[PDB]
Design a protein around this ligand. Sequence first.
Ligand SMILES: [Mg+2]
Ligand SMILES: [Zn+2]
Ligand SMILES: [Zn+2]
Lengths: 1166, 50, 99, 89, 76
Amino acid sequence: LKAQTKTEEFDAIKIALASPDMIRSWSFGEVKKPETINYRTFKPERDGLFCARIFGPVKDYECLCGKYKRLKHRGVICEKCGVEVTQTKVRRERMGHIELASPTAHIWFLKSLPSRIGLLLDMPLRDIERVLYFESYVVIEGGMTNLERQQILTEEQYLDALEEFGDEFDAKMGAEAIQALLKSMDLEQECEQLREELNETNSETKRKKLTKRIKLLEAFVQSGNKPEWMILTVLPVLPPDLRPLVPLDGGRFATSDLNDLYRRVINRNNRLKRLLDLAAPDIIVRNEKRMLQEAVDALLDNGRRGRAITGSNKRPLKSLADMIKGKQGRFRQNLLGKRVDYSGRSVITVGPYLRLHQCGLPKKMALELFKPFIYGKLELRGLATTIKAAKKMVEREEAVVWDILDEVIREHPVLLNRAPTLHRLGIQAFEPVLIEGKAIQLHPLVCAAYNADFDGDQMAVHVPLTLEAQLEARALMMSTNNILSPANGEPIIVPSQDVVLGLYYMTRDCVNAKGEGMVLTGPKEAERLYRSGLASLHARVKVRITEYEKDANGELVAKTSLKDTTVGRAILWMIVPKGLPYSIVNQALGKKAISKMLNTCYRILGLKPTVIFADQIMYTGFAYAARSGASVGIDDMVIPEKKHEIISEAEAEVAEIQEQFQSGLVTAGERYNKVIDIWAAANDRVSKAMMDNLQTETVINRDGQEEKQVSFNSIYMMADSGARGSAAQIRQLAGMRGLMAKPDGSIIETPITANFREGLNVLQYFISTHGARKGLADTALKTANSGYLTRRLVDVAQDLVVTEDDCGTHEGIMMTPVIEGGDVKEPLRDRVLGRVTAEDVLKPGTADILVPRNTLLHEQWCDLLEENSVDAVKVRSVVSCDTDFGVCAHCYGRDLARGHIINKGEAIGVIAAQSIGEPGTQLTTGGLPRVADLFEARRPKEPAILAEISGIVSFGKETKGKRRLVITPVDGSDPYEEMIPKWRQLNVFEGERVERGDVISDGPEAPHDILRLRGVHAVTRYIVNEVQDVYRLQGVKINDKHIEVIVRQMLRKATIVNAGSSDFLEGEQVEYSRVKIANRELEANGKVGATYSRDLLGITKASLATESFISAASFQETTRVLTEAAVAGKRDELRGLKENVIVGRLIPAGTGYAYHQDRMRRRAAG
Amino acid sequence: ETLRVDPTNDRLSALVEIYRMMRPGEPPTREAAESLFENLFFSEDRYDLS
Amino acid sequence: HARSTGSYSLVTQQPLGGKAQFGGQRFGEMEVWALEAYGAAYTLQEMLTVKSDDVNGRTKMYKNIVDGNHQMEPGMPESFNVLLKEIRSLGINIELEDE
Amino acid sequence: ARVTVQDAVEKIGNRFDLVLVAARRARQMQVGGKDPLVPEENDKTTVIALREIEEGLINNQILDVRERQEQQEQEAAELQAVTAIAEGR
Amino acid sequence: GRTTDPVRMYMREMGTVELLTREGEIDIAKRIEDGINQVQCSVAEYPEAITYLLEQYDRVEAEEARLSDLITGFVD
Ligand SMILES: [Mg+2]
Ligand SMILES: [Zn+2]
Ligand SMILES: [Zn+2]
């Protein structure tokens, strides 16, 4: 089959240097004049930056002169002024060129940090520039006389050398010289000679540089690039419409700066040509050449020499490099953002009536949004003659169109998004409900996922146009399909505030209330008792209930009994579906328990019942909370009666210590510490006073004299339930608030003795102000830090996607409870949950396998593990996965918004990064910067040192600034001797044996070490446990998984030790390497296989290396990436997410994973 | 010890090193260095603390 | 604010309000990642190709939206297509290989 | 409406391939080539396809089979027409 | 040194050239006169250079050209 010629759907992309002829290929004509437009008739002057002949017709399908105006005439080149009449769009396409008189250096290859022309010629930059400016002469192909090939000479020196040797010696200057150098260069010979020289001499200094350079050279050879091309003969001109002259209001014009630049390059160029034909003196033509160099440089990339300024305006004119780079840090117009059709936004409101799967959509918004659908549907049923008439109909807002809109809306989800999108729940799909009014209504249960308050936050809507988008939205981005955080299996649909105050007030009990002690047949007549006003909502009562347990095999058991409960719990029970026990509603139902209700419901009955349950819980929560008449008065906040006395005694303490300072019994600092301690203790006292009084002081009577229970006071119920408020803020309300701190970090020794219930005076408020401002500043900053972190994270992961199904390795990490110093800072059950066993696990006795090799451990398996005493389970992790270029689903875990095992093709790196990043706002060496330090691998300030090798050690030599430590292995050779500075207090025992990785000193340790000495599992364990320490200290739930994938991406590269295929010390992919030595172990060489050493790269460092250059050009420094890729002729195959997003095709993950796979296998095949 | 790191000797020398500091790369002149240095903090025109 | 199909920017063809008929909402990097976490490729492609940057795909889409056929024949986003010309304007040859 | 797609995800494992298959079928209905396999409630083709997945009468295997049959159904029609192209000789 | 900024590498490059004396100008101009007059005389010694001018003037009177396209005028 004939392969093809014209447009197919392309794969990969290539980048390289451009030949003069190659540049001429693109060019459809030479621009010979600086002229733009005629100045009266605004038509393009021919052969100028804007030209109809070279580039294209000014108006569609029309010749410039106007002779051929007919759409029939097309491939015709006009006889008057040749313009092929074609759409004006081709003026956005067709390029041009300029033939430069003298050769010119391309600023990108001159000034890139490792100057390409420089290190290709093994010549310094300053020399090359000194030669370019005609400030000295340089030799080329010196022959055998007196002189080196790359040697530089002066005027007098060149003259003398010329007098001595006329021929068989050669020297030039300027651009032509450098081009002569590059053209004369023979890379192959250099290769041979350098290999020889590499072999002969042994010095680290010599052969390091030697091998680096030979590698560079052979790379450039394999590229297909010939060095001369770094010097520009021909200069391409960008299409006119990409730098337009287009008119404005008031008859004014506006144009891109490139014109101003290009024009210059033309003028000077032309002038230079003139200066040749007039036979000008050298001093002149030289100046003109330099000027041409400067102009071209300014055109390509401005700012690397002089920074030319635009006409009449100080602001420096934007060059082509600045066009490519873009701005707002690193953003390429895909990255910063892109405007999108079929969308909208507005202020959002509540809408509690909504089911969890829908959202209120303003009528007008839905009208303008679905407009094309409405047009098509109106004439589909024939209510409109034509599309025009349809427009007139909906524009008139005729009454009939609203129903048609009701039709086009029904099954057709819309995407809702909020401003700070962090995790994937920042965008969710909903079913539109047509609503009068201009505000968007959003289901309350979802308000948690968006982090959306009602204080005027706005949300944006997007319409899923294509069918695939409708089904993606409904089956993926749908609200009901994500009930669980991807970070941890806990429900994100958890009831927020009003609702939980509702259920809390519902199931609670006071000591004596109407209907106390009586008995009822069932919840129905319990509610019937309540609504009629006979029985109180909360009273201790026995009622018959029928609960269910599915504990049979897939089968619901039933049992009935008399339960001792309250009226409220009885009424609430009506909602609880099926197989849930009555035990769950029989408690007080706080925000914590009310969550575990939904959770258990999900892990038992499945999705649908959990959804409908949650909805019901919300509705009843709101209803009953409204019934409750909960409120807040000024007398709802109770100050301790003993406050003033505490203040007084604590006030005696300070004057005591003060009297002791007056008599010198105590030093100033010790005094300060003392007084501060007494005030702090006082604060604690008042807090634990008001806490007791506020909490238990309801003292009430049942049938006897008295009894006392937990208070029914409003603010207490609020803080206790988990609705809103907390012991700290309550403490600030009634008891005194804190001891503030002055800006320098010190803490004022006279706290705020008053509170908010009382008044604060001038001083106390002024002092509170600093705390406030620092609070706002700090939080607003930590937002940015979080964002930056997520950025680095997704950059380092991204393309990691579940690819294979099972790599099939027994490998994994040993999972134990975290067990820190006290009892169990986190259990085993949470650590191993939803993960998969590496190998079968024992009972205390054996040949009895409870869990069989690799099996998803769900709640039942973990509970079965809990029944038995098993303290340890080895678990497969994403870090140990044998699969190359991705993760097998078998190694990942089940975790998702769904409880089933992770799907094939879901992109895990991104969700991992998001999962780590979203909570980062809540984080407070320690803290968020501690996390950033961790993922960046950074060696700490005052690190410890670990024993290089096991065996008995001792101290050796003396004090030079290092007192040497000599290690003595039992069997093996001694020679390892480490130089440890002796002014650092040691740990290691002079007479004791130390295992490798022991403490030879104290302080934190660099994970590079932990990886090298302790091993891979050790280092990943250190990272995960430390970062998890940071997060868990703040109360943040993040599964170890995500952190583990981040870690895997950190360790992607390693450095070889042995040999037999590739180079010695190269940092390289362990995917590539391991697949190569697994390939080498058999066939090939029998075994030549090479040993490597795993390396640890920080996230920002690991994100640096990416095969795809289009990807790198996005988030890295654009200029350098483009150059550095362009020299090697690097060929980007795409294959990743970022690059495919940039080029605008299907993501090689998720829904798209089917396509790419089908394409990936078709590639490199029959 | 500040003097020991001082490359200059006399007034003209210092003025040269100052003028070549402010407007470098171009050949210094006596009248130029004097004019500049007098024009910086000592001229009623180019300087005011008010 | 709401927009279906409005005016478009000249320099790069992108949605822009010229009538005080508002330019579309800006779909950023974070929103892209959000789409990437979900398995939705087509929502994202339609987001950055047909709904915005494709001077062909947008109209060809509109006609299908009215015809009752929900599909997309995406083509190449004009941003990247311009970037090609910008890169190639230098001494850099950037090509689209194979088939 | 279809509130949760979970049952369909049960019927075909991947859940991305669910979107794909349901899409393909939804187009078999939307572009008018075929008719629903189950009562349309006013559910748009989007949801009809999902109902078809849930009831287990539609997935990738079934579809590929049907289409592969239709190829021969047309190849049956054109049988004389294309053999009349013996002008190739 | 060289601060780049090509204005400078010009300014310093021309500044080497020494100003002309009032006599030197006349010397140089005289040199010019000598040089040119040599090529003029060398042209006068070429037969084809003459015959060409003849064949051209025969074309001028034949209306195949104009007097402006041959001579700018003679001495006179
Ligand atoms: Mg807010
Ligand atoms: Zn014409
Ligand atoms: Zn694996």
